[PDB]
Design an enzyme around this catalytic site. Sequence first.
Site, mmCIF file in Angstrom:
data_model
loop_
_atom_site.group_PDB
_atom_site.id
_atom_site.type_symbol
_atom_site.label_atom_id
_atom_site.label_comp_id
_atom_site.label_asym_id
_atom_site.label_seq_id
_atom_site.Cartn_x
_atom_site.Cartn_y
_atom_site.Cartn_z
ATOM 1 N N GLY C 80 0.830 -1.197 0.000
ATOM 2 C CA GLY C 80 0.000 0.000 0.000
ATOM 3 C C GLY C 80 0.868 1.253 0.000
ATOM 4 C CG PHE C 81 -0.077 4.605 -1.473
ATOM 5 C CD1 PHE C 81 -1.091 3.857 -2.035
ATOM 6 C CD2 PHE C 81 0.820 5.257 -2.305
ATOM 7 C CE1 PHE C 81 -1.217 3.762 -3.405
ATOM 8 C CE2 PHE C 81 0.709 5.160 -3.682
ATOM 9 C CZ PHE C 81 -0.314 4.417 -4.234
ATOM 10 C CB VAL C 124 1.747 -4.271 8.185
ATOM 11 C CG1 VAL C 124 2.566 -3.072 8.665
ATOM 12 C CG2 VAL C 124 2.305 -5.575 8.764
ATOM 13 C CG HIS C 181 -1.231 1.290 15.073
ATOM 14 N ND1 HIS C 181 -0.204 1.510 15.968
ATOM 15 C CD2 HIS C 181 -0.753 1.646 13.856
ATOM 16 C CE1 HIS C 181 0.848 1.990 15.322
ATOM 17 N NE2 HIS C 181 0.541 2.091 14.038
HETATM 18 N N1 NAI Z 1 0.217 -1.329 11.648
HETATM 19 C C1 NAI Z 1 1.303 -0.685 12.107
HETATM 20 O O1 NAI Z 1 1.682 -0.633 13.458
HETATM 21 C C2 NAI Z 1 2.126 0.026 11.113
HETATM 22 C C3 NAI Z 1 1.604 0.068 9.849
HETATM 23 N N2 NAI Z 1 2.326 0.633 8.868
HETATM 24 C C4 NAI Z 1 1.879 0.658 7.424
HETATM 25 O O2 NAI Z 1 2.599 -0.319 6.665
HETATM 26 C C5 NAI Z 1 2.587 -0.005 5.271
HETATM 27 C C6 NAI Z 1 4.004 -0.251 4.712
HETATM 28 O O3 NAI Z 1 4.977 0.692 5.120
HETATM 29 P P1 NAI Z 1 6.423 0.687 4.410
HETATM 30 O O4 NAI Z 1 6.975 -0.643 4.171
HETATM 31 O O5 NAI Z 1 7.265 1.724 5.111
HETATM 32 O O6 NAI Z 1 5.952 1.324 2.976
HETATM 33 P P2 NAI Z 1 6.737 1.233 1.567
HETATM 34 O O7 NAI Z 1 6.086 2.269 0.683
HETATM 35 O O8 NAI Z 1 8.254 1.386 1.649
HETATM 36 O O9 NAI Z 1 6.360 -0.186 0.925
HETATM 37 C C7 NAI Z 1 5.084 -0.577 0.434
HETATM 38 C C8 NAI Z 1 5.213 -1.443 -0.834
HETATM 39 O O10 NAI Z 1 3.939 -1.951 -1.268
HETATM 40 C C9 NAI Z 1 4.034 -2.124 -2.676
HETATM 41 N N3 NAI Z 1 2.716 -2.459 -3.239
HETATM 42 C C10 NAI Z 1 1.700 -1.633 -3.696
HETATM 43 N N4 NAI Z 1 0.665 -2.413 -4.123
HETATM 44 C C11 NAI Z 1 1.015 -3.727 -3.928
HETATM 45 C C12 NAI Z 1 0.374 -4.944 -4.194
HETATM 46 N N5 NAI Z 1 -0.831 -4.997 -4.789
HETATM 47 N N6 NAI Z 1 1.008 -6.129 -3.885
HETATM 48 C C13 NAI Z 1 2.282 -6.111 -3.342
HETATM 49 N N7 NAI Z 1 2.942 -4.913 -3.122
HETATM 50 C C14 NAI Z 1 2.303 -3.749 -3.400
HETATM 51 C C15 NAI Z 1 4.723 -0.839 -3.148
HETATM 52 O O11 NAI Z 1 5.291 -0.874 -4.447
HETATM 53 C C16 NAI Z 1 5.810 -0.713 -2.066
HETATM 54 O O12 NAI Z 1 7.036 -1.327 -2.467
HETATM 55 C C17 NAI Z 1 2.000 1.424 5.192
HETATM 56 O O13 NAI Z 1 0.594 1.439 4.830
HETATM 57 C C18 NAI Z 1 2.149 1.940 6.611
HETATM 58 O O14 NAI Z 1 1.272 3.023 6.827
HETATM 59 C C19 NAI Z 1 3.581 1.064 8.941
HETATM 60 C C20 NAI Z 1 4.158 0.956 10.238
HETATM 61 C C21 NAI Z 1 3.424 0.456 11.322
HETATM 62 O O1 GAG Z 2 3.429 3.667 14.006
HETATM 63 C C1 GAG Z 2 4.238 3.637 13.094
HETATM 64 O O2 GAG Z 2 5.434 3.541 13.305
HETATM 65 C C2 GAG Z 2 3.829 3.730 11.675
HETATM 66 C C3 GAG Z 2 4.647 3.967 10.580
HETATM 67 O O3 GAG Z 2 3.865 3.949 9.440
HETATM 68 N N1 GAG Z 2 2.534 3.738 9.788
HETATM 69 C C4 GAG Z 2 2.462 3.589 11.117
HETATM 70 O O4 GAG Z 2 1.389 3.363 11.790
#
Ligand code: NAI
Ligand code: GAG
Lengths: 315, 315, 315, 315
Positions: C80-81, C124, C181
């Site tokens: 995702g984004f 995530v 979260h």
């Molecule tokens: N739940 C939690 O405690 C946390 C959640 N998050 C969330 O996690 C996500 C990922 O964060 P990052 O890795 O830093 O982002 P990132 O942008 O570096 O990586 C996301 C990847 O998903 C890819 N992608 C898009 N559509 C896809 C699909 N259909 N199938 C497979 N890949 C696809 C993109 O090309 C990109 O490489 C974000 O939405 C962020 O907000 C991030 C940190 C903590």
């Molecule tokens: O809590 C974090 O560290 C996060 C980073 O990207 N999305 C989030 O939720």
Amino acid sequence: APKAKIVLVGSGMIGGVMATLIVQKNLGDVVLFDIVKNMPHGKALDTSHTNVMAYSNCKVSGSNTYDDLAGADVVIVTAGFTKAPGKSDKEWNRDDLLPLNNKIMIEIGGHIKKNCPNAFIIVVTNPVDVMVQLLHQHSGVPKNKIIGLGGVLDTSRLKYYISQKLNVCPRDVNAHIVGAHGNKMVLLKRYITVGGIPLQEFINNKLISDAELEAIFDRTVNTALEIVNLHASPYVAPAAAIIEMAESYLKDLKKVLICSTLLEGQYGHSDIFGGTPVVLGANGVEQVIELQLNSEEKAKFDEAIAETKRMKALA
Amino acid sequence: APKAKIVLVGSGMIGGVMATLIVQKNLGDVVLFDIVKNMPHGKALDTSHTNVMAYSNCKVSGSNTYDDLAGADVVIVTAGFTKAPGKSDKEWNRDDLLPLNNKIMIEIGGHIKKNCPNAFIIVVTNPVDVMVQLLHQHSGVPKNKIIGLGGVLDTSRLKYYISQKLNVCPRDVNAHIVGAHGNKMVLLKRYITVGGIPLQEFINNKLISDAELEAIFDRTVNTALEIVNLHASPYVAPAAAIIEMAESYLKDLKKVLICSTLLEGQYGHSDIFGGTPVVLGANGVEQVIELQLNSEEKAKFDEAIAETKRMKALA
Amino acid sequence: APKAKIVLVGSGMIGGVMATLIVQKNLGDVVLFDIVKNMPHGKALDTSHTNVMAYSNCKVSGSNTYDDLAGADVVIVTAGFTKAPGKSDKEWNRDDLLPLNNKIMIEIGGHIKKNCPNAFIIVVTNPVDVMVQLLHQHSGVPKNKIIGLGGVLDTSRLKYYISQKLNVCPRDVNAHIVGAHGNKMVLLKRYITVGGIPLQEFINNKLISDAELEAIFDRTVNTALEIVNLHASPYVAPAAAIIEMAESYLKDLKKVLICSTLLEGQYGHSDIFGGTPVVLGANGVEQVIELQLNSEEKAKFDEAIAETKRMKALA
Amino acid sequence: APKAKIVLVGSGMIGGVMATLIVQKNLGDVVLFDIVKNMPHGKALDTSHTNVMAYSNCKVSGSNTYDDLAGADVVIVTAGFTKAPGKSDKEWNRDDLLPLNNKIMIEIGGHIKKNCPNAFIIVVTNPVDVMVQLLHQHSGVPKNKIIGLGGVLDTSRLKYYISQKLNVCPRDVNAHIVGAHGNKMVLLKRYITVGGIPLQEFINNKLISDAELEAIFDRTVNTALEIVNLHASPYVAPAAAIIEMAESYLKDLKKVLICSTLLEGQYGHSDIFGGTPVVLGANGVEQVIELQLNSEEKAKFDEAIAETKRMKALA
Ligand SMILES: NC(=O)C1=CN([C@@H]2O[C@H](COP(=O)(O)OP(=O)(O)OC[C@H]3O[C@@H](n4cnc5c(N)ncnc54)[C@H](O)[C@@H]3O)[C@@H](O)[C@H]2O)C=CC1
Ligand SMILES: O=C(O)c1conc1O
Ligand SMILES: NC(=O)C1=CN([C@@H]2O[C@H](COP(=O)(O)OP(=O)(O)OC[C@H]3O[C@@H](n4cnc5c(N)ncnc54)[C@H](O)[C@@H]3O)[C@@H](O)[C@H]2O)C=CC1
Ligand SMILES: NC(=O)C1=CN([C@@H]2O[C@H](COP(=O)(O)OP(=O)(O)OC[C@H]3O[C@@H](n4cnc5c(N)ncnc54)[C@H](O)[C@@H]3O)[C@@H](O)[C@H]2O)C=CC1
Ligand SMILES: NC(=O)C1=CN([C@@H]2O[C@H](COP(=O)(O)OP(=O)(O)OC[C@H]3O[C@@H](n4cnc5c(N)ncnc54)[C@H](O)[C@@H]3O)[C@@H](O)[C@H]2O)C=CC1
Ligand SMILES: O=C(O)c1conc1O
Ligand SMILES: O=C(O)c1conc1O
Ligand SMILES: O=C(O)c1conc1O
């Protein structure tokens, strides 16, 4: 998911260290089986508390019932005797353990066949190259599912002694001891490396001499005797060597480790077990590696196999 | 007791993975230093929280001030550029990084000399065999206290590719790449082993061919280029290789690891740094090991040193 | 035996750290899947070489094909984004990621249902409490086989900040953050302990004040924002938190870890996912633990669930 | 850098497991000291070979000479007897070990004072709360540099038994046992948590009853007796508990661990050692934590201290 079940058939000195190391490494649930009443339950209880210190979650339970072999994924056999009645420490010889341990393998084999025919088996009881084949025949398991302890333990000694002389990390010394575990073990000078480099380079540079190596070879062959006379039949390194083998199987590491295995033409030998490098992974013995020995080295290998054959006949 | 202090001079891609692995291994307190404002503080904060998941207790702090080098036990230098402006990914060459990174080493050396002259130094910035000697001269540290990254990383690739073909544990393949880190790196076919056994035995048995090995050698030399074109200048394996080196020093492991070090007659060369097996422990570079190369192998080594000399002149 | 297969659906910043940590811990074979051409193959190659430094044996491969989900044991979804187009770093809010990531979960769910319906799933992608339920509904998996990341990461921050003030090992501080979260996360002062001891004892002794704790609570809620402004959307701690969860499942540790899970009457709520302590082992979510909250604490929990419901409606 | 030196004063059952675990964790060089001729040299030799299997580099040497204490960084004292001559297993009591072990502490203290006055000391010999203070007085070391084993071991049992009933990871249960190690140990029901949550919540939910807990408390107090009767005076968990303590000191972890320490007004007591949570790091005992006990709990603590005082008088 779900955890492996590891049954230690024999809960003496080596069995206790193995249970401890399994919990340290979170390798699986453990059963300490033995014929002695009460003792394995006591060792199991003591060991179970270490899950807290180790951040692990492995059950450790004692047993005096053979049917607890049911469902076993790995079976490790140390059951038997460590010395012969009447013998002094000075005359300690693994060969004298032949009449004492023969029937124990037959009995255990019948229980494995009935309870866990698909388990991976590691045999330790001496003389190991004889006992492992006896258990293979009575348990019915495939040749890729049973091995014996020998080379990992013998080479740990050779590797360690050389590392101390040269002042390098012990695991950086690699070496091969083959044929059988006992006084006819074959130490292969040509296959020693230090940091992947031929040991002969260090000999050429006067960092270690040929005479120093001869003394280290004699020390390696006589280590168990040296310890037996100072303390007891060794148990801590044997245990660590067995767990490295079991771990390679459980985690599919595919490590090259020297163990006793069924020979089917390698080195010119068939219908007998002997020590050689093998690859251990998810499928058991995945590969049997044949060293391209010279005629002088082959002659020593032949001497080792002859000794296993002699005792096989007396069992 | 008291923890070591590890200063990462450069907080980019390799710096971030190094900070992560240090916390995982509980190796010491970490400082992420960089010229970029704010960024190292953000990476430090993120990384600091992993102490909980890891059961560790290492501080991780950011810095934009050179005097935070004071009290450093280990200094790891990744500061500089990864590509030259104007160059396409296809024409990426480590040599082009010479004019971009020269003055950065001089500046860092002056700060080390003033703040932590007794620290152990690991240089990464490219071209590494040139930059490490430049930093040695400007920092004033003893020759046993500074090394450069090269061989641990290059051989990890060669070892890995061979292990996949033969289906054995990656660390069971041992191999030597020497001279310099770059396109003239010297891959030594004669010094490859698998489970301590000469690779030639596996070639004789048709388990891997000479042609397959030639293709693996070319892949090894071109790996960074292969990745750069798919993704970016590599950072995860480089980081892991640097931490294995730093760990051997901090814990006095005495591992034999191939690194860039000051040559004083080995291979016929003096007054230059080049890749060779060394022993790393509490005293730094405890031993420099000279491989007993043949004339054909020496000729390739000479080609690698000539390239380092050429760039040394242009810096 | 045989190794688990772990598919990382999304190969960006968090995906890369997860692949690195899996190899360090020898947890299983890894697939880095992404829609971006070439990139995951490059990251996989770099990461694969660390098997040597780590003494591990895990394959790491890249993928641009959804059917590589076939045979997966664990699926981790970061696709995702991380930010909304037009938004400044200062106005970064997880809620704004709702329209950007909704359809991505639907698409991935259909592929899971077809290829690996018996896999354990960790979601995530933000906003996580909404996305996890969306994926649950479209993948068809049982409620005990899917969870969302939240509490392990949020509490790592709270635990860490308190440990620094009191000078104790980070993992010795235990704490609970529940509901969702995001900015309405519920920090439970009454359930904080240090060495198993009520935090109120340390407050009574003037070792930490109520005012200091209020400042730490605000810092915890705003950590991601704090880092985003200094560097980037956090990735190293998130990765470590996800791997602790996956590890508990794979090794049947039965750790109590706070995650987003389907509520069926706990806290008065049904038909929605929310953060609460759960037990993770071989059978997935083995137990859902309901904290015996007071009315003031329940009122905050209700506020958090209301926010998830609001966004659920807009998806 | 340089490795710590750890002297095990006493090379019996607990000493052997400690040497094994130190090598597994690469914690430092080890000396197994004992009055028995030959035995420690044999155990040391066996244990030294495990460096290979463990990828470690720790020397392990035997000793029959007190001056080998010179240069010690940590000294661990298990020297003495485990049972009193004439006593049956059924009447085994730690108090009966008072006349047997008193002079051994005096002798060892004089050697520590002369050879390693700046070492960190851990006392194990029973009755431990008496012996530790005796050694403190005769060795001359500062009060922050000596502790006794008790609470880490006693709580491991309580934590483990509860974790099995509730089916959660053992280390997720936290609990406090204070006052003294022996039959008057004080088990604090009010300070038990599971996943950081008050145990009373699990009692309210009928997941564990008050009656079940009473039976677990009795089992905890009588564990050593239970094992002694089945097998022997316990050694594996004791060893693991001691190494967790020594590790926290050596690596500056700052873990909160319950140990016997000099009381200076805490709980109303002075001029005596007793069990309480402490923080162990680079500076030794960095903090002594006083639990805010109620009057009923204080009354039990007073009973435990009275017993230590009674035996102190008879020594
Ligand atoms: N739940 C939690 O405690 C946390 C959640 N998050 C969330 O996690 C996500 C990922 O964060 P990052 O890795 O830093 O982002 P990132 O942008 O570096 O990586 C996301 C990847 O998903 C890819 N992608 C898009 N559509 C896809 C699909 N259909 N199938 C497979 N890949 C696809 C993109 O090309 C990109 O490489 C974000 O939405 C962020 O907000 C991030 C940190 C903590
Ligand atoms: O809590 C974090 O560290 C996060 C980073 O990207 N999305 C989030 O939720
Ligand atoms: N192969 C190798 O490299 C080595 C082999 N060995 C051999 O390993 C064996 C074990 O050594 P230790 O553990 O030190 O001996 P040990 O004597 O301490 O333990 C052996 C245990 O087997 C038990 N036992 C007897 N019959 C049994 C049965 N039917 N089922 C289950 N248990 C039974 C005994 O009661 C005893 O507890 C010996 O034969 C020894 O010679 C020992 C070291 C190395
Ligand atoms: N020797 C080897 O085997 C390998 C060497 N390298 C080299 O390592 C270097 C680092 O690579 P990456 O981390 O991927 O690059 P990167 O670009 O992500 O990080 C480099 C960092 O250095 C910083 N920097 C610039 N001047 C500085 C100064 N004076 N002090 C402190 N920081 C400063 C930059 O701001 C940047 O954050 C490159 O030169 C690369 O070519 C890379 C891999 C392997
Ligand atoms: N504090 C605690 O939580 C626990 C305390 N203990 C106590 O630990 C002690 C050790 O138990 P184990 O190792 O099982 O006993 P063990 O009998 O196997 O070993 C004790 C060793 O001390 C040696 N020794 C006697 N005088 C000595 C001296 N002057 N210097 C060096 N060595 C000497 C003996 O020869 C023997 O090898 C016992 O007093 C036991 O009651 C045991 C478990 C837990
Ligand atoms: O080699 C050893 O260490 C042994 C000990 O007991 N039997 C053996 O073979
Ligand atoms: O070899 C590599 O991986 C490298 C990456 O960046 N510079 C290098 O030398
Ligand atoms: O509590 C134990 O386990 C003990 C064993 O020997 N002495 C003890 O105190």
